[PDB]
Amino acid sequence: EAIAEARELMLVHKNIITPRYGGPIIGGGQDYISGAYLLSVKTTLLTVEEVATILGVTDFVGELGEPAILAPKPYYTGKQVISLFLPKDFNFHGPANISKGPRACKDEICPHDSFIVIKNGLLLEGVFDKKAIGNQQPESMLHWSIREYGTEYGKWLMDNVFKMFIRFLEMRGFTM
Amino acid sequence: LINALSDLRIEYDGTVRSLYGDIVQVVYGDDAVHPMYSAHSKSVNVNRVIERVIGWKR
Amino acid sequence: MTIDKINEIFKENWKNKLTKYEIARIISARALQLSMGALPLIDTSNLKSDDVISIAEEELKRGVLPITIRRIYPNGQVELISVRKI
Amino acid sequence: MIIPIRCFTCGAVVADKWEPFSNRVMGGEDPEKVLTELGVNRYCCRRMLLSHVNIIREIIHYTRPI
Amino acid sequence: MPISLIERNGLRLRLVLENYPLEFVNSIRRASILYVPVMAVDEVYFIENNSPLYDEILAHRLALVPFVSDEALEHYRPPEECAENCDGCYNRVYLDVEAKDQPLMIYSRDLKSEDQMITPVSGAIPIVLLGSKQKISLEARLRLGYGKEHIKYSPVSVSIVRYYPKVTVLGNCEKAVEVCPEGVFAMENNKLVVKNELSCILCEECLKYCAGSVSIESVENKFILEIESVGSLKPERILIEASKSLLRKLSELKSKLEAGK
Amino acid sequence: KGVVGILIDQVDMPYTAKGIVPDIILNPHALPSRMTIGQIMEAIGGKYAALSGKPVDATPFLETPKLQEMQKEILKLGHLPDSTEVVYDGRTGQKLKS
Amino acid sequence: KEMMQGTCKISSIEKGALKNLYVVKMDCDNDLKIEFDITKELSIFSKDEEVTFIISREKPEYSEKDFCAHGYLFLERQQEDGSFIDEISLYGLIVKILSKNGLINSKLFKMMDHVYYCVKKK
Amino acid sequence: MEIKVIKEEQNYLELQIDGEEHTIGNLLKGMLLKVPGVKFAAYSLPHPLITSITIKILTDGSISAREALIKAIELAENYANLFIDEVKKI
Ligand code: F3S
Ligand SMILES: [Zn+2]
Numbered sequence A: 001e002a003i004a005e006a007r008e009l010m011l012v013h014k015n016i017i018t019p020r021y022g023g024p025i026i027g028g029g030q031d032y033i034s035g036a037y038l039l040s041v042k043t044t045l046l047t048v049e050e051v052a053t054i055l056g057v058t059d060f061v062g063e064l065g066e067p068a069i070l071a072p073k074p075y076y077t078g079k080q081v082i083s084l085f086l087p088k089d090f091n092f093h094g095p096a097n098i099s100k101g102p103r104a105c106k107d108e109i110c111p112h113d114s115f116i117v118i119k120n121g122l123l124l125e126g127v128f129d130k131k132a133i134g135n136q137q138p139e140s141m142l143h144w145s146i147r148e149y150g151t152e153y154g155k156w157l158m159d160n161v162f163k164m165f166i167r168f169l170e171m172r173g174f175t176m
Numbered sequence B: 001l002i003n004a005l006s007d008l009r010i011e012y013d014g015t016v017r018s019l020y021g022d023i024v025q026v027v028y029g030d031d032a033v034h035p036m037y038s039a040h041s042k043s044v045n046v047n048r049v050i051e052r053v054i055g056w057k058r
Numbered sequence C: 001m002t003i004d005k006i007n008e009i010f011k012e013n014w015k016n017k018l019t020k021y022e023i024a025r026i027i028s029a030r031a032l033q034l035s036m037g038a039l040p041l042i043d044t045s046n047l048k049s050d051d052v053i054s055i056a057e058e059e060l061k062r063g064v065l066p067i068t069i070r071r072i073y074p075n076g077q078v079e080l081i082s083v084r085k086i
Numbered sequence D: 001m002i003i004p005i006r007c008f009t010c011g012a013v014v015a016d017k018w019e020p021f022s023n024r025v026m027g028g029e030d031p032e033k034v035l036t037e038l039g040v041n042r043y044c045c046r047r048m049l050l051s052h053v054n055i056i057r058e059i060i061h062y063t064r065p066i
Numbered sequence E: 001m002p003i004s005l006i007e008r009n010g011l012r013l014r015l016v017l018e019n020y021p022l023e024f025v026n027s028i029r030r031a032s033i034l035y036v037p038v039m040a041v042d043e044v045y046f047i048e049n050n051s052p053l054y055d056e057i058l059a060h061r062l063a064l065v066p067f068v069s070d071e072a073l074e075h076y077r078p079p080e081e082c083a084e085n086c087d088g089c090y091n092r093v094y095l096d097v098e099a100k101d102q103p104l105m106i107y108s109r110d111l112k113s114e115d116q117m118i119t120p121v122s123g124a125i126p127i128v129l130l131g132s133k134q135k136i137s138l139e140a141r142l143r144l145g146y147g148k149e150h151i152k153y154s155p156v157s158v159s160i161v162r163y164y165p166k167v168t169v170l171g172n173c174e175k176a177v178e179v180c181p182e183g184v185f186a187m188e189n190n191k192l193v194v195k196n197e198l199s200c201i202l203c204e205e206c207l208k209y210c211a212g213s214v215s216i217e218s219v220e221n222k223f224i225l226e227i228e229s230v231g232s233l234k235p236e237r238i239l240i241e242a243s244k245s246l247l248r249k250l251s252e253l254k255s256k257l258e259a260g261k
Numbered sequence F: 001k002g003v004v005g006i007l008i009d010q011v012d013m014p015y016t017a018k019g020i021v022p023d024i025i026l027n028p029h030a031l032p033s034r035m036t037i038g039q040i041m042e043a044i045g046g047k048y049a050a051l052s053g054k055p056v057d058a059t060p061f062l063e064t065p066k067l068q069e070m071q072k073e074i075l076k077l078g079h080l081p082d083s084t085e086v087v088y089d090g091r092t093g094q095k096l097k098s
Numbered sequence G: 001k002e003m004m005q006g007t008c009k010i011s012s013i014e015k016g017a018l019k020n021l022y023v024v025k026m027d028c029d030n031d032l033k034i035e036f037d038i039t040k041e042l043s044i045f046s047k048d049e050e051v052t053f054i055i056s057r058e059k060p061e062y063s064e065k066d067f068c069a070h071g072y073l074f075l076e077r078q079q080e081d082g083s084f085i086d087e088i089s090l091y092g093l094i095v096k097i098l099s100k101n102g103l104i105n106s107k108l109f110k111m112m113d114h115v116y117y118c119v120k121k122k
Numbered sequence H: 001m002e003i004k005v006i007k008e009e010q011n012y013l014e015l016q017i018d019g020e021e022h023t024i025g026n027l028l029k030g031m032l033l034k035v036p037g038v039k040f041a042a043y044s045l046p047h048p049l050i051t052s053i054t055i056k057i058l059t060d061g062s063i064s065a066r067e068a069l070i071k072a073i074e075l076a077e078n079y080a081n082l083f084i085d086e087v088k089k090i
């Protein structure tokens, strides 16, 4: 009886949202945010081998689709690799944590990647930072994603997509 | 504070009552919404619902 | 609207739903029953795990348990809710 | 206590280069030239040789009476 | 798919590989460390010890001493085989020393080996310093082993695989000679000639100052493989044994994969 | 302070262009909040001390040699002045972009 | 089929806001002002040359000496002066089109179309 | 060194190998990415403290995944033999 109650009421993934306020207490940390920003930035292009190396840490297997850029050289992109995990009916429009300084464009027409635009599960512009995957950040895209696809999709996402951030961070160089 | 608020419970009619019988609140909070299930201290975000429905054409 | 509209909405919502505490209690009782006698009500060959907890969860999910819950309201009214789909 | 047999980072043997280096430096020769001509070029092995203390020469006086 | 040679020092070997994939070259580099067998001390039988060093420390120091395991790869059973009993796969060395009145340093030349073709690489490795009236008497057993099991069995010190550079001089900027840490460039009659192109590590620091006088690329199919041995085996033998280990592993995998299809 | 999270062999460590692998890896994210510039300064000074063989004194308010001199001497000895190095991945052999 | 094609010359190649970003501006016939983002590895254009661009759902034939990609049409805006702003996201790289009748208002395309965009040298 | 099959179809294979690490996994992945008809190939190390790898192969149906793995092994063996024969000449 004690084991059944512990499994049915006290599991970690069932308590992603804290009772103090409506917002996730389990979320991205410090290396995760930097990796997400570096992978999501506009200037990231990956080859087939790099994409395979990045996706080897997750459970994803299937069709990658056509590369984002076909000629002169076949290049993928960070947003295309990220978009393989978002549900196919998820929409989100909101600013990023880097939209505070001179990058504030306050609308979708932004020369920077300072505005997040997701339509039908496709990440079209914007970067991931503390305001999208960070912990203790209510009304973020992670919060809405969990709220609409259960702690089940919350746990699946946190287990899968959060490892590509670390893998890409160590694939690139991050020093001080 | 724990020793003060230890014996409060939510009944099947929505009221908040102590285990000794007396009534603390006629309905929990003001609309019987758990803070854990709320959208950041809010029953439902209507703007978020409108976005979820028609954001692919904005 | 007996006392408040919110209370009526609350009771209407919970009239035909099982709270997580009720689910946990049912699963605990069924798991304790299966641990000694009480042969399962399902086909225990396709199950991924042979432990009692998983069998209890599967039986609750399929809706074969002959268990009813009594909800006693503060004014004395009683409500019987059955978990079998039938 | 005593000079390690191998460099910690790379497995290069460095113990055999201690008694030359420890002597010629005491003879007035600058450590850099001696280290370069002894065959030590990676700065990990230079760190190994440059920061040895050699306590055992004091501990031989105070040894277990077993 | 030729292989070219850059330099051959006493223990260093540098090669250029021209039509091999990066995965194979990296596998050879890793197997040069992990899957090449050498002789090292496995166990020590202690009879007496009065030195400041304890038994475990002395055993570790003895184990870290490299032995010449060049002719022993053909007379001793490898670890992959049965190797833990059936004597005929263990070598034995002895050490019996004593100090009379003055402190005495014990070098690796004092280790007497039962089999004469297995000797320490260097005879001037200090092992332990003995005070007055202190003595040591021990027997050590040597056997083959792979660097995967313990790092004392690794036959190399550094194993390196890097890209093949291509440096071209377009202008005549004089800054590049004093910026490159590898000394690739030089000034000859004020022309900025490239002396040793293969020394560039693709640092890309000359691009920060010249930026128009120097262009840096990496050749897509050539790699530079540099290894340095410790003294037990010659570098060519190390490379051959690493590739043989790859061959054995691939053969076993294919044999037990195609069977039971 | 900190505990050991994992132990990595020499083959899996990210070797540099000269074959030097790190003995300890420290996360950059620990620096900007604690604001210990002395850590990086000591790293540079120690590398210079090992390369040159010259003594390094880090007494407060009277440090000799200065950072600029140490960096120039490091550059003169075959290494990059900013104490950075080109690093390859020990598991795949791919050159890191930074 | 709702293919769109044009021929026009490059105006400028600026530096952009990000680290190694670049923006290519093209002034074109019929009051088109194509302006698209590229990176260093994709820079095969000069300061001024004649090129041909095509936007179409059907995948066209391409070589290894021209630049093109596929993305989605996700932004349709009207300006206060009667102009239009159209944006195509090549999974992150932005192609902005300034026209008169618009790309969706003129019934050429609709919202969120998977389109191929190719630019070749003439 | 023991192999086992987690999943298997005509154009999909998931193979768990115990006793192996990056040395063989990276080589096999690099060789598989060169075999024609293979659409996806990857290897994973489930935990650094455990010496075991998992190889995932997905083809387009022209060639079976097991055949692709055998071809990759053949390519690797050919490269190793060529390397031995060329190193022996210097
Ligand atoms: S200046 Fe020097 S060492 Fe390397 S990349 Fe540039 S050459
Ligand atoms: Zn902006």
Ligand SMILES: [Zn+2]
Pocket: D007, D008, D009, D010, D011, D012, D042, D043, D044, D045, D046
């Ligand atoms: Zn060293």
